[PDB]
Design a protein around this motif. Structure first.
Motif, PDB file in Angstrom:
ATOM      1  N   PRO A  41       0.796  -1.232   0.000  1.00  0.00           N
ATOM      2  CA  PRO A  41       0.000   0.000   0.000  1.00  0.00           C
ATOM      3  C   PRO A  41       0.819   1.268   0.000  1.00  0.00           C
ATOM      4  CG  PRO A  41      -1.020  -1.615   1.423  1.00  0.00           C
ATOM      5  CD  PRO A  41       0.279  -2.211   0.967  1.00  0.00           C
ATOM      6  N   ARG A  45       0.852   4.405  -2.639  1.00  0.00           N
ATOM      7  CA  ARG A  45       0.694   5.799  -2.272  1.00  0.00           C
ATOM      8  C   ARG A  45       1.893   6.645  -2.739  1.00  0.00           C
ATOM      9  NH1 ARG A  45       0.009   9.748   2.782  1.00  0.00           N
ATOM     10  NH2 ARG A  45      -1.848  10.810   1.944  1.00  0.00           N
ATOM     11  N   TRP A  48       1.596   7.552  -6.320  1.00  0.00           N
ATOM     12  CA  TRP A  48       0.565   8.570  -6.492  1.00  0.00           C
ATOM     13  C   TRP A  48       1.066   9.941  -6.051  1.00  0.00           C
ATOM     14  CZ3 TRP A  48      -3.111  12.092  -6.824  1.00  0.00           C
ATOM     15  CH2 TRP A  48      -3.736  12.642  -5.674  1.00  0.00           C
ATOM     16  N   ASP A 143      -6.066  17.955   0.257  1.00  0.00           N
ATOM     17  CA  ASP A 143      -6.529  17.867   1.655  1.00  0.00           C
ATOM     18  C   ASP A 143      -7.613  16.828   1.805  1.00  0.00           C
ATOM     19  OD1 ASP A 143      -6.708  21.499   1.904  1.00  0.00           O
ATOM     20  OD2 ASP A 143      -4.959  20.188   1.872  1.00  0.00           O
ATOM     21  N   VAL A 151     -12.864  18.010  -4.314  1.00  0.00           N
ATOM     22  CA  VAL A 151     -12.197  16.874  -4.929  1.00  0.00           C
ATOM     23  C   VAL A 151     -12.258  17.013  -6.460  1.00  0.00           C
ATOM     24  CG1 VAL A 151     -12.415  14.366  -5.340  1.00  0.00           C
ATOM     25  CG2 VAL A 151     -12.597  15.271  -2.979  1.00  0.00           C
ATOM     26  N   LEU A 168      -9.604   5.952  -9.223  1.00  0.00           N
ATOM     27  CA  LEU A 168      -8.332   6.096  -8.530  1.00  0.00           C
ATOM     28  C   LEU A 168      -8.535   5.995  -7.032  1.00  0.00           C
ATOM     29  CD1 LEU A 168      -6.678   9.072 -10.483  1.00  0.00           C
ATOM     30  CD2 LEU A 168      -5.731   6.781 -10.238  1.00  0.00           C
ATOM     31  N   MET A 169      -9.633   6.557  -6.533  1.00  0.00           N
ATOM     32  CA  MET A 169      -9.887   6.549  -5.097  1.00  0.00           C
ATOM     33  C   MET A 169     -10.085   5.140  -4.565  1.00  0.00           C
ATOM     34  SD  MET A 169      -9.759   9.490  -3.469  1.00  0.00           S
ATOM     35  CE  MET A 169     -10.949  10.682  -4.126  1.00  0.00           C
ATOM     36  N   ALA A 171      -8.163   2.801  -4.674  1.00  0.00           N
ATOM     37  CA  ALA A 171      -6.919   2.424  -3.992  1.00  0.00           C
ATOM     38  C   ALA A 171      -7.001   2.530  -2.481  1.00  0.00           C
ATOM     39  CB  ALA A 171      -5.787   3.271  -4.512  1.00  0.00           C
ATOM     40  N   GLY A 175      -4.241  -0.727   2.612  1.00  0.00           N
ATOM     41  CA  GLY A 175      -3.516  -0.070   3.710  1.00  0.00           C
ATOM     42  C   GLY A 175      -4.424   0.557   4.747  1.00  0.00           C
ATOM     43  N   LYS A 176      -3.971   1.662   5.317  1.00  0.00           N
ATOM     44  CA  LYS A 176      -4.693   2.309   6.408  1.00  0.00           C
ATOM     45  C   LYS A 176      -4.110   3.678   6.624  1.00  0.00           C
ATOM     46  CE  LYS A 176      -3.744   0.998  10.664  1.00  0.00           C
ATOM     47  NZ  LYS A 176      -3.356   2.396  11.032  1.00  0.00           N
ATOM     48  N   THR A 177      -4.796   4.472   7.439  1.00  0.00           N
ATOM     49  CA  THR A 177      -4.302   5.771   7.855  1.00  0.00           C
ATOM     50  C   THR A 177      -3.567   5.531   9.175  1.00  0.00           C
ATOM     51  OG1 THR A 177      -6.190   6.456   9.287  1.00  0.00           O
ATOM     52  CG2 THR A 177      -6.413   6.830   6.913  1.00  0.00           C
ATOM     53  N   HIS A 178      -2.637   6.419   9.507  1.00  0.00           N
ATOM     54  CA  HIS A 178      -1.853   6.339  10.742  1.00  0.00           C
ATOM     55  C   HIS A 178      -1.934   7.718  11.365  1.00  0.00           C
ATOM     56  CE1 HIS A 178      -0.129   3.825   7.552  1.00  0.00           C
ATOM     57  NE2 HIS A 178       0.118   2.934   8.494  1.00  0.00           N
ATOM     58  N   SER A 182      -1.056  11.514   9.304  1.00  0.00           N
ATOM     59  CA  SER A 182      -2.115  12.334   8.677  1.00  0.00           C
ATOM     60  C   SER A 182      -3.155  12.906   9.638  1.00  0.00           C
ATOM     61  CB  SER A 182      -2.866  11.485   7.652  1.00  0.00           C
ATOM     62  OG  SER A 182      -3.454  10.357   8.295  1.00  0.00           O
ATOM     63  N   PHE A 261      -4.562   5.024 -13.503  1.00  0.00           N
ATOM     64  CA  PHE A 261      -3.320   4.981 -12.713  1.00  0.00           C
ATOM     65  C   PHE A 261      -2.114   5.116 -13.677  1.00  0.00           C
ATOM     66  CE2 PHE A 261      -1.230   4.544  -8.745  1.00  0.00           C
ATOM     67  CZ  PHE A 261      -0.227   3.589  -8.809  1.00  0.00           C
TER      68      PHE A 261
HETATM   69  C1  HEM Z   1      -8.630  13.428  -2.404  1.00  0.00           C
HETATM   70  C2  HEM Z   1      -7.656  12.564  -2.676  1.00  0.00           C
HETATM   71  C3  HEM Z   1      -6.905  11.821  -1.661  1.00  0.00           C
HETATM   72  C4  HEM Z   1      -6.734  12.128  -0.342  1.00  0.00           C
HETATM   73  C5  HEM Z   1      -7.185  13.397   0.331  1.00  0.00           C
HETATM   74  C6  HEM Z   1      -6.045  11.060   0.258  1.00  0.00           C
HETATM   75  C7  HEM Z   1      -5.647  11.025   1.614  1.00  0.00           C
HETATM   76  C8  HEM Z   1      -5.055   9.931   2.232  1.00  0.00           C
HETATM   77  C9  HEM Z   1      -4.704   9.874   3.627  1.00  0.00           C
HETATM   78  C10 HEM Z   1      -4.924  11.017   4.603  1.00  0.00           C
HETATM   79  C11 HEM Z   1      -4.145   8.637   3.842  1.00  0.00           C
HETATM   80  C12 HEM Z   1      -3.596   8.050   5.125  1.00  0.00           C
HETATM   81  C13 HEM Z   1      -2.086   8.436   5.225  1.00  0.00           C
HETATM   82  C14 HEM Z   1      -1.476   7.938   6.523  1.00  0.00           C
HETATM   83  O1  HEM Z   1      -2.046   8.200   7.601  1.00  0.00           O
HETATM   84  O2  HEM Z   1      -0.432   7.238   6.525  1.00  0.00           O
HETATM   85  C15 HEM Z   1      -4.150   7.938   2.581  1.00  0.00           C
HETATM   86  C16 HEM Z   1      -3.692   6.655   2.406  1.00  0.00           C
HETATM   87  C17 HEM Z   1      -3.572   6.095   1.158  1.00  0.00           C
HETATM   88  N1  HEM Z   1      -3.888   6.655  -0.045  1.00  0.00           N
HETATM   89 FE1  HEM Z   1      -4.809   8.310  -0.340  1.00  0.00          FE
HETATM   90  N2  HEM Z   1      -5.793  10.120  -0.673  1.00  0.00           N
HETATM   91  C18 HEM Z   1      -6.296  10.500  -1.851  1.00  0.00           C
HETATM   92  C19 HEM Z   1      -6.236   9.857  -3.074  1.00  0.00           C
HETATM   93  C20 HEM Z   1      -5.520   8.698  -3.314  1.00  0.00           C
HETATM   94  C21 HEM Z   1      -5.236   8.139  -4.587  1.00  0.00           C
HETATM   95  C22 HEM Z   1      -5.694   8.786  -5.880  1.00  0.00           C
HETATM   96  C23 HEM Z   1      -4.449   6.987  -4.379  1.00  0.00           C
HETATM   97  C24 HEM Z   1      -3.915   5.970  -5.345  1.00  0.00           C
HETATM   98  C25 HEM Z   1      -4.293   5.887  -6.626  1.00  0.00           C
HETATM   99  C26 HEM Z   1      -4.333   6.837  -2.981  1.00  0.00           C
HETATM  100  C27 HEM Z   1      -3.680   5.816  -2.353  1.00  0.00           C
HETATM  101  C28 HEM Z   1      -3.537   5.720  -0.961  1.00  0.00           C
HETATM  102  C29 HEM Z   1      -2.959   4.535  -0.313  1.00  0.00           C
HETATM  103  C30 HEM Z   1      -2.427   3.289  -0.949  1.00  0.00           C
HETATM  104  C31 HEM Z   1      -2.943   4.776   1.023  1.00  0.00           C
HETATM  105  C32 HEM Z   1      -2.441   3.840   2.120  1.00  0.00           C
HETATM  106  C33 HEM Z   1      -1.005   4.096   2.562  1.00  0.00           C
HETATM  107  C34 HEM Z   1      -0.555   3.147   3.645  1.00  0.00           C
HETATM  108  O3  HEM Z   1      -1.256   2.179   4.038  1.00  0.00           O
HETATM  109  O4  HEM Z   1       0.579   3.354   4.118  1.00  0.00           O
HETATM  110  N3  HEM Z   1      -4.966   7.887  -2.389  1.00  0.00           N
HETATM  111  N4  HEM Z   1      -4.694   8.753   1.640  1.00  0.00           N
END
Ligand code: HEM
Length: 289
Positions: A41, A45, A48, A143, A151, A168-169, A171, A175-178, A182, A261
């Protein structure tokens, strides 16, 4: 401002497949990261985020220059936690020092998606490392505390339409948020690429709550979470239709994600007409490895 793809000298498909394989073998090996989620994951990210700095208006940012290796972008608060993906890719770069930074970062994301049983993502080589002064300023990534209008407007800067945005979203199945990264906590801790983001949106019972960091997030009784930006895809009626489509059509979601992607990872790059066709890499599993 034009960034022409330039193939790493003397390299061919098989060369990149070896880089793919090293990434994939390391994903399998280093399986304990983040409570056994693995690096899949975070690598998605990373890919991206190095792409999502692009601005279609002047062609600054994007994956091409590999500028995430520079202090200013590396330390972008929006990039907190991606250092872990970078560290993962270090020894890969040492094993294959001829690959550009931009090619490595984007290929990491492609490899992660495919090795997590996601769709094949065609990938093209030739990003070229550009100097530190080409590093885009912080603030270009989106944000999480905003609504569907935000968005929609935000993604126009990356030349993404409603279907590409919703695709795309997905994705966010991964994984997860930490909280430390964030200011959000929770998620599925999933490392298999599916359409479950859409199914969770539609089937769970969501409640909007403030979290410990005083940020708003949508929380389900089963313990899943969604950002305001995620949840906006069901508040907005155009996005909702597409959510519903992907929740009910795995193959469609796979095809659309793959296109979106690859487009994301190639935004800002001019490929000359003698450039190779896109490469489709075999998974480890398809190679009997
Ligand atoms: C409005 C658009 C987006 C916002 C605001 C957003 C925001 C976030 C946030 C706040 C996290 C958690 C980060 C953390 O705490 O470590 C996250 C995780 C993630 N995002 Fe997004 N994201 C967006 C779009 C996308 C897109 C377009 C992709 C891929 C195509 C993506 C892939 C991921 C992945 C894979 C994670 C997990 C990371 C991990 O597990 O370490 N996101 N995103």
């Amino acid at each position: 401002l034009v960034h022409v793809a330039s193939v790493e000298k003397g390299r061919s498909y098989e060369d990149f497949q070896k880089v793919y394989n090293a990434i994939a073998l390391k994903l399998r090996e280093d399986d304990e990261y983040d409570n056994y989620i693995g690096y899949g994951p975070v690598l998605v990210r990373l890919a991206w985020h190095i792409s999502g700095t692009w601005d279609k208006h002047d062609n600054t940012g994007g994956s091409y220059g590999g500028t995430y290796r520079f202090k200013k972008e590396f330390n972008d608060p929006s990039n907190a936690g991606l250092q872990n993906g970078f560290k993962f890719l270090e020894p890969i770069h040492k094993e294959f020092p001829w690959i550009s930074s931009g090619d490595l970062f984007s290929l990491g994301g492609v490899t992660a998606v495919q090795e997590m049983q996601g769709p094949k993502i065609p990938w093209r080589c030739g990003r070229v490392d550009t100097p530190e002064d080409t590093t885009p300023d912080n603030g270009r990534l989106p944000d999480a505390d905003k609504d569907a209008g935000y968005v929609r407007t935000f993604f126009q800067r990356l030349n993404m339409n409603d279907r590409e945005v919703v695709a795309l979203m997905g994705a966010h199945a991964l994984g997860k948020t930490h909280l430390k990264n964030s200011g959000y906590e929770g998620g599925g801790a999933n490392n298999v690429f599916t359409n479950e983001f859409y199914l969770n949106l539609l089937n769970e019972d969501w409640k909007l709550e403030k979290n410990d960091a005083n940020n708003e997030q949508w929380d389900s009784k089963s313990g899943y979470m969604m950002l305001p930006t995620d949840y906006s895809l069901i508040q907005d009626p155009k996005y909702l239709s597409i959510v519903k489509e992907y929740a009910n059509d795995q193959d469609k979601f796979f095809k659309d994600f793959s296109k979106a992607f690859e487009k994301l990872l190639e935004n800002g790059i001019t490929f000359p007409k003698d450039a190779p066709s896109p490469f489709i890499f075999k998974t480890l599993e398809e190679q009997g490895l």
